[PDB]
Structures are given as structure tokens and as C-alpha cells.
Amino acid sequence: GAMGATTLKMGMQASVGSVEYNSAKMLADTLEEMSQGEIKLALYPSAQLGDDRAMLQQLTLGDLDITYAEFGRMGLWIPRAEAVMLPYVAKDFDHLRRMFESDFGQGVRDEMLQKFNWRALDTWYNGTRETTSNRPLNSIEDFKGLKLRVPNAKQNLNYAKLSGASPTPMSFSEVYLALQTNAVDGQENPLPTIKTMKFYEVQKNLAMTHHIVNDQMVIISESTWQKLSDTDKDIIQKAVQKVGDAHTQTVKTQEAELVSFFKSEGINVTYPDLEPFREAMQPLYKEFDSNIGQPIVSKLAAM
Amino acid sequence: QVQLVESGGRLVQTGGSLRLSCAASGDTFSNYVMGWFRQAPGKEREFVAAISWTGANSYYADSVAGRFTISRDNAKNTVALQMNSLKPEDTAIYYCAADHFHVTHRKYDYWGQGTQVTVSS
């Protein structure tokens, strides 16, 4: 093969052992097989190249080929993209992916490509945040008085505020003790985090609020992409989608196993009606639609 | 509206040192890469240097590296270009610019009006 291989490079914040890393490695292996060795992918994990914004910057300049980035994370640079991580806008992942393919999604992806040389190949489901507490939460009404810990993130703050709770920003490192001692009444995170940090050990209740649905977009530097042959483009396109279907199924399966596990562990799992939460988010939706000067959210919410 | 104003242009010696400055206003400074460009009379607008949002990383044109030094003060909303060992070919209008990312495939979003530097001996 005088033409040699093409060794692409992929950066990620996540570390060996994680689902993101295992999916990246599956992507490396898939590309190498489907190309018969002509496309290889080198992985750089654990933020060895910087954080996600540093890595996107290396994509913009063609110094790095592939990275992950949340759809909503684009709102830092394309303000309307933030609509997709306002709480309760995405109902489930299929809905988030519908937004990615919609006229709105497509307009965000054309701006990503034109302004910053980012070509979004796919969106992969990466889990939904849920709510633990020291008392059961069976409707939005139980949220009143609830000292809910959140990270110091705008949308996490907004979920707790507009649900009626008492937002309590606090460093992740303090959370477990604050729960154990009822300095705080609850917190919110994906289920794997709840398991890994043993928050279920000091929280008797889990509520399936489904308030924040996450993804990871797979993004390739446009400078790389233009350099590639059309067959190589197709192998990459297909492999990313194939690995994303497996990624998405892995996350969904693990969530279902974890809810089952929590129930079997004596965690009390509730399922509040969510239209009351979507309705309680309206003030923020129309504020967002105003500061953007255009009805974005309601269209997205309807998809 | 982010606005950028450049100061410090002079005429100066060949082999001389000159510090240019840029005052940025209008938005969270640290959300923006800051760049210096320059355009000489017969040539096209040309990249010179750029500095990342925190200053952790910087970028330089080949023609200027090792003797120019870009820096920023996120407390003062300033970016600076320390030019050492100037050379007649450095002569141009120098422009401050801002963007969310450093980019080579297009213009930065925002631009000052520029400051004239001339070096001759």
C-alpha cells in the first residue's frame, strides 16, 4: 500500500473504562476493519489535549480530526443551539435527534461547519438526569421547600428554580455528605453517577423527572473531511452511525438495569407526571425565545 | 456590540521594540480568542498572533515568531502585542480582532480600526 493508511486522531475528556471511551475504541476498530487498514484512529483520552473547547479549537484548525461535543454545548458560540438543553425541551432521545435533523438542527450544523470548521456526523444518546431526595417526589408539588443541590450551571439552576424547589449550588465534592446529613434534601444527575457516587446510599427516593437529556455529537474537522476520498467519507459516516446505535442502546440498557437495581435495593422510585414540569418551564422558554428574537423553543418542543 | 480599540502605533527604529495594546469592550472578554492582524500598503491583510481565552495557548505567524509576544489581561479586558527586533517589512496598519475561536479559513467576527506602525533606519 504505497498510499499508506490514514491515521486520524480523536480527542475526548473521558477516560479508559467509560462508555464514551469504549464507544470511541469500537469506532477505531470499526473504521480499521471496514477500510481494510486504510483508516486508523488514534485515541487521546482523559483531556490529554485539553478540555472540550480546547479540542474543538484544534478541530477548527485541522490539528485534531474528531472529538465529542454536546448538541446544547454549541449554545456558547451559536446562541440558539442552547434551546436544546433547556430543561424539558427534549422529551427523550429520539426527540433530541429529531431536533438534530430538523430545519433547526440543520441550520445549527451549517453554522458549525461554516464558522468553525466542525462537521457534525451524528448525535449519540448519552443519558438523562434524574432526581434523588430524602422524601418521595410524586408530583411537581412535592418540589416546594425541597433544598435541591445543583451544579453551578445555568440550566440546572433553572430546573430547580422553576420546578418550585430551593436551588442549592454546591461543589460535587460536598454533595454526598450534604445528603447524608440532610443539609440538602436531594440532587440530580444521571443514574450511573448516582450509582458510582453511592448517592443512593444516602437518598431513599429516586424520581424519574427526565428533566435534562444529554447527547454527544461526533464531530470531524472539515479540513480533514475535504482531504478524504468519497469512499473514505462513507466508511466514516457509516461507522459513526453504526457505533452510535450501539452507544445509544448501551446507555438506555444501563439506565433500565440501574432503575431495576435501585428498586431491588430498596430505593423508592417515583414517576411524576411531566407535563406540569414542561408547563412550569414556560417562563424560561419564552425568555429564551425573546433574547433570541424568534420563536425557537415551542417549535422544538412540538417536534 | 464588542468593540476593539488599538493603541501604540509609532514610527520606530529598525531593531527597536514597540508595545501595542487593545482595549476590548462589550461582552465577556474571556469568551473570545484575541488576534492581531496587519495589512501593509501593497499586500493583503495578514495574520500575526492570537491568544486563547485564558491565555493558555497562543499562535504566531511564521514571519514574526520568536520576536513578537501576544498576551492578555482578563482583569483589564486588554490584549497586547510586544514586538521586539522590528524590521522594515513589519511596517503596516496593525488590527486587533476578536472571535470565539482562532480561525484561518475566514475573517474574525470583530475588528478594531487599527494603528499604524512604521519601522525604518
Alpha carbon of A62: minimum distance to chain B alpha carbons (Å)? 10
Tell me how the structure was determined.
X-ray
- What cell does A136 get? 418521595
Nearest CA-CA partner of A144 in A163, A169, A157? A163
Longest dimension (CA), chain A: 69
The CATH number of A6-126+215-264 is 3.40.190.170
Q: Do A79 and A86 meet the contact criterion of CB atoms below 8 Å apart?
A: no
A60: nearest CB among B56, B57, B103? B103
Pairing of strands B18-25, B78-83: antiparallel
DSSP string, B42-90: SS--EEEEEE-TTSS-EEE-GGGTTTEEEEEETTTTEEEEEE-S--GGG
A63 to chain B, any CB pair closer than 8 A? The answer is no
Cβ–Cβ of B52/A57 closer than 8 Å? yes
- The CATH H-level superfamily of A130-211+265-302 is Bacterial extracellular solute-binding protein, family 7 (3.40.190.170)
Task: Report the candidate in A107, A114, A81, A68 with the shortest Cα–Cα distance to residue A222.
Answer: A114
Cite the residue boundaries of each domain of chain A with CATH code 3.40.190.170.
Answer: 6-126+215-264, 130-211+265-302
In terms of residue numbers, what domain contains B21?
Answer: 3-102+110-119
Q: Which of A120, A125, A131 is nearest to A81 (CA)?
A: A120
Q: Please indicate whether, in this complex, the C-beta atoms of B31 and A76 are within 8 angstroms of each other.
A: yes
Chain A positions touching B31 (Cβ under 8 A) are 76
Domain count, chain B: 1
Give the pairing of strands A268-270 and B3-7. unpaired
| Interfacial A residues in 212-241 facing B (CB < 8 Å) | 223
Domain at B8, CATH number? 2.60.40.10
Residue A57: list chain B partners with CB under 8 A: 52, 57, 101-102
Give CA–CA dist A139/A149, Å, rounded: 18
Q: Which long-range contacts (CB under 8 A, 24 or more apart) does A230-239 make?
A: A232/A6, A232/A35, A232/A38, A232/A39, A235/A31, A235/A34, A235/A35, A235/A39, A236/A31, A236/A39, A236/A121, A237/A121, A238/A34, A239/A27, A239/A30, A239/A31, A239/A34
Header resolution in angstroms: 2.0
Looking at residue A141, the DSSP 8-state letter turns out to be: G
Query: Which amino acid, one-letter code, is at B41?
Result: P
Taking an 8 Å cut-off on Cβ atoms, the answer to whether B101 and A57 are in contact is yes
Q: How far is B17 from chain A (nearest CA, A)?
A: 30
A178 backbone dihedrals φ, ψ, rounded to 5°: -60, -35
Rounded distance between C-alpha atoms, residue A199 and residue A203, angstroms = 6
C-alpha cell at A14: 473521558
CB contact under 8 A, A76 and B52: no
State the Cα–Cα distance between residues A186 and A179, nearest whole angstrom: 6
